[PDB]
Design a protein around this motif. Structure first.
Motif, PDB file in Angstrom:
ATOM      1  N   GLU A 153       6.307 -10.722   4.325  1.00  0.00           N
ATOM      2  CA  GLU A 153       6.914 -11.591   4.987  1.00  0.00           C
ATOM      3  C   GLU A 153       5.204 -12.775   5.343  1.00  0.00           C
ATOM      4  O   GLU A 153       5.526 -14.232   5.255  1.00  0.00           O
ATOM      5  N   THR A 154       4.591 -11.542   5.934  1.00  0.00           N
ATOM      6  CA  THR A 154       3.213 -12.140   5.798  1.00  0.00           C
ATOM      7  C   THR A 154       2.333 -11.598   5.604  1.00  0.00           C
ATOM      8  O   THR A 154       2.229 -10.100   5.377  1.00  0.00           O
ATOM      9  N   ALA A 155       0.963 -12.247   5.352  1.00  0.00           N
ATOM     10  CA  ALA A 155      -0.494 -11.144   4.822  1.00  0.00           C
ATOM     11  C   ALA A 155      -0.699 -11.903   6.098  1.00  0.00           C
ATOM     12  O   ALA A 155      -1.506 -13.163   6.133  1.00  0.00           O
ATOM     13  N   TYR A 156      -1.992 -10.540   6.595  1.00  0.00           N
ATOM     14  CA  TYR A 156      -3.068 -10.842   7.562  1.00  0.00           C
ATOM     15  C   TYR A 156      -4.509 -11.253   6.918  1.00  0.00           C
ATOM     16  O   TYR A 156      -4.571 -10.589   6.561  1.00  0.00           O
ATOM     17  N   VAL A 157      -5.608 -12.796   7.059  1.00  0.00           N
ATOM     18  CA  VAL A 157      -6.781 -12.801   7.035  1.00  0.00           C
ATOM     19  C   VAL A 157      -7.378 -11.791   7.667  1.00  0.00           C
ATOM     20  O   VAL A 157      -8.217 -12.636   8.894  1.00  0.00           O
ATOM     21  N   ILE A 158      -7.829 -10.916   7.827  1.00  0.00           N
ATOM     22  CA  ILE A 158      -8.970 -10.020   9.243  1.00  0.00           C
ATOM     23  C   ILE A 158     -10.707 -10.341   8.907  1.00  0.00           C
ATOM     24  O   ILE A 158     -11.351 -10.422  10.175  1.00  0.00           O
ATOM     25  N   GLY A 159     -11.403 -10.848   7.331  1.00  0.00           N
ATOM     26  CA  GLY A 159     -12.266 -10.887   7.932  1.00  0.00           C
ATOM     27  C   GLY A 159     -12.966 -10.329   6.860  1.00  0.00           C
ATOM     28  O   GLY A 159     -12.284  -9.728   5.984  1.00  0.00           O
ATOM     29  N   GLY A 160     -14.866 -10.921   6.606  1.00  0.00           N
ATOM     30  CA  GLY A 160     -15.406 -11.626   7.010  1.00  0.00           C
ATOM     31  C   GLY A 160     -15.371 -13.106   7.052  1.00  0.00           C
ATOM     32  O   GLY A 160     -14.445 -13.534   5.920  1.00  0.00           O
ATOM     33  N   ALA A 161     -16.944 -14.042   7.335  1.00  0.00           N
ATOM     34  CA  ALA A 161     -16.681 -14.977   6.941  1.00  0.00           C
ATOM     35  C   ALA A 161     -16.373 -16.136   5.530  1.00  0.00           C
ATOM     36  O   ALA A 161     -15.752 -17.308   6.156  1.00  0.00           O
ATOM     37  N   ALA A 162     -16.573 -15.311   4.892  1.00  0.00           N
ATOM     38  CA  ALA A 162     -16.983 -16.136   3.295  1.00  0.00           C
ATOM     39  C   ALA A 162     -14.838 -15.961   2.817  1.00  0.00           C
ATOM     40  O   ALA A 162     -15.137 -16.766   2.824  1.00  0.00           O
ATOM     41  N   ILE A 163     -14.382 -15.256   3.713  1.00  0.00           N
ATOM     42  CA  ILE A 163     -13.488 -14.687   3.038  1.00  0.00           C
ATOM     43  C   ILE A 163     -12.141 -15.735   4.140  1.00  0.00           C
ATOM     44  O   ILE A 163     -11.487 -16.407   3.389  1.00  0.00           O
ATOM     45  N   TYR A 164     -12.919 -16.088   5.201  1.00  0.00           N
ATOM     46  CA  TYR A 164     -12.037 -17.055   6.451  1.00  0.00           C
ATOM     47  C   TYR A 164     -12.381 -18.371   5.358  1.00  0.00           C
ATOM     48  O   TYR A 164     -11.201 -18.910   5.252  1.00  0.00           O
ATOM     49  N   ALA A 165     -13.454 -18.787   5.490  1.00  0.00           N
ATOM     50  CA  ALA A 165     -13.792 -20.247   4.912  1.00  0.00           C
ATOM     51  C   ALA A 165     -12.998 -20.040   3.650  1.00  0.00           C
ATOM     52  O   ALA A 165     -11.970 -21.315   3.777  1.00  0.00           O
ATOM     53  N   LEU A 166     -13.402 -19.019   2.479  1.00  0.00           N
ATOM     54  CA  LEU A 166     -11.763 -19.396   1.716  1.00  0.00           C
ATOM     55  C   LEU A 166     -10.842 -19.808   1.857  1.00  0.00           C
ATOM     56  O   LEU A 166     -10.049 -20.560   1.226  1.00  0.00           O
ATOM     57  N   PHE A 167     -10.221 -18.677   2.604  1.00  0.00           N
ATOM     58  CA  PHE A 167      -8.418 -18.715   2.636  1.00  0.00           C
ATOM     59  C   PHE A 167      -8.032 -19.923   3.441  1.00  0.00           C
ATOM     60  O   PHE A 167      -6.936 -20.543   4.076  1.00  0.00           O
ATOM     61  N   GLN A 168      -9.161 -20.401   4.544  1.00  0.00           N
ATOM     62  CA  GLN A 168      -8.344 -21.907   5.530  1.00  0.00           C
ATOM     63  C   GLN A 168      -8.055 -23.023   5.004  1.00  0.00           C
ATOM     64  O   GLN A 168      -6.692 -23.299   5.305  1.00  0.00           O
ATOM     65  N   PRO A 169      -7.657 -23.704   3.671  1.00  0.00           N
ATOM     66  CA  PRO A 169      -7.093 -24.609   3.297  1.00  0.00           C
ATOM     67  C   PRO A 169      -5.917 -24.345   2.865  1.00  0.00           C
ATOM     68  O   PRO A 169      -4.861 -25.165   2.728  1.00  0.00           O
ATOM     69  N   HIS A 170      -5.558 -23.051   2.822  1.00  0.00           N
ATOM     70  CA  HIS A 170      -4.218 -22.128   2.138  1.00  0.00           C
ATOM     71  C   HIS A 170      -4.097 -21.650   3.836  1.00  0.00           C
ATOM     72  O   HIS A 170      -2.461 -20.549   3.507  1.00  0.00           O
ATOM     73  N   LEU A 171      -4.175 -21.975   5.404  1.00  0.00           N
ATOM     74  CA  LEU A 171      -3.556 -21.518   6.183  1.00  0.00           C
ATOM     75  C   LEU A 171      -2.317 -21.941   6.519  1.00  0.00           C
ATOM     76  O   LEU A 171      -2.603 -23.231   7.109  1.00  0.00           O
ATOM     77  N   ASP A 172      -1.133 -21.190   7.030  1.00  0.00           N
ATOM     78  CA  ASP A 172      -0.629 -21.580   7.767  1.00  0.00           C
ATOM     79  C   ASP A 172      -0.735 -21.524   9.419  1.00  0.00           C
ATOM     80  O   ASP A 172       0.100 -22.137   9.853  1.00  0.00           O
TER      81      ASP A 172
END
Lengths: 154, 157
Positions: free
Chosen positions: A94-113
């Motif tokens: 239903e939902t999926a969480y992005v918990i780390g690290g820094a490269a993963i964050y940058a990567l997913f931030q344009p798709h973040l709800d």
């Protein structure tokens, strides 16, 4: 929906050296771990193996630049943002969480709800800058050591 | 210093499932190709692949997951922002440019020192976007009008 959990200081720092510029915060650690406990997690391969004793959620979609078979039955390998989302969708998430690290964050931030940020009040790794006028602060509970914010896209 | 170069419409759209969504502007392409002419260019593997007949700067740091053999005498491989800065540090370069695509602009945004952005003027439909950036963190160094776009140079605060 795609949402990231992150604790960051006022300069957006999430890590110095390896981990935290800041000390204790078990208030923080109880919080995020409860949050993600029953839904799929998306994480770097080194964070995964840095948590082998206590694995983070319903499942783990592990971001690796390399093909990997895992020990755990709940671990999955994704090479892209798209592939990760497909794996979580096959999990009936239903939902999926992005918990780390820094490269993963940058990567997913344009798709973040949504963004569950723990605002902590000198380092090398960073949480991505977001537009303050294009996200609505959905909630802002004052806590012990930090102040938890859920930010939704307008 | 890491610095990106990109052209986006309003909505921050930089593309639609393959190419530009807006048509002409060769004053964009002349100024963008000449900008990056001699320094190293950070870019994706598929963007490199597609640009094989032309090729944008004096050495191309190709961002990719796979370790790959490239038979082009100078077109290096990278598995991170850090490795990509090391290799340009090695080529004695002053400035390293991010040409993209979308995933690469994202991966280089918290590290950027400058942004060189062509604001193509209408709203368009797409699916690949240039990242959002905080207003408090960036200062606009300069801004010029040209035909069909306006180039903006944003320095960090």
């Amino acid at each position: 929906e795609l949402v990231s959990v992150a604790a960051l200081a006022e300069n957006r720092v999430i890590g110095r050296d390896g981990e935290l510029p800041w000390p204790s915060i078990p208030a923080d650690k109880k919080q995020y771990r409860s949050r993600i406990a029953d839904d799929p997690v998306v994480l770097g391969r080194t964070t995964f193996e840095s948590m082998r004793d206590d694995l983070p959620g319903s499942a783990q979609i592990v971001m690796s630049r390399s093909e990997r078979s895992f020990s755990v039955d709940t671990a999955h390998r994704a090479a892209s943002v798209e592939e990760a989302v497909d794996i979580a969708a096959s999990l009936d998430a239903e939902t999926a969480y992005v918990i780390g690290g820094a490269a993963i964050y940058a990567l997913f931030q344009p798709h973040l709800d949504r963004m569950v940020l723990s605002r902590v009040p000198e380092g090398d790794t960073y949480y991505p800058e977001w537009d303050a006028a294009e996200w609505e602060l959905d909630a802002e509970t004052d806590h012990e050591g930090f102040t938890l914010q859920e930010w939704v896209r307008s």
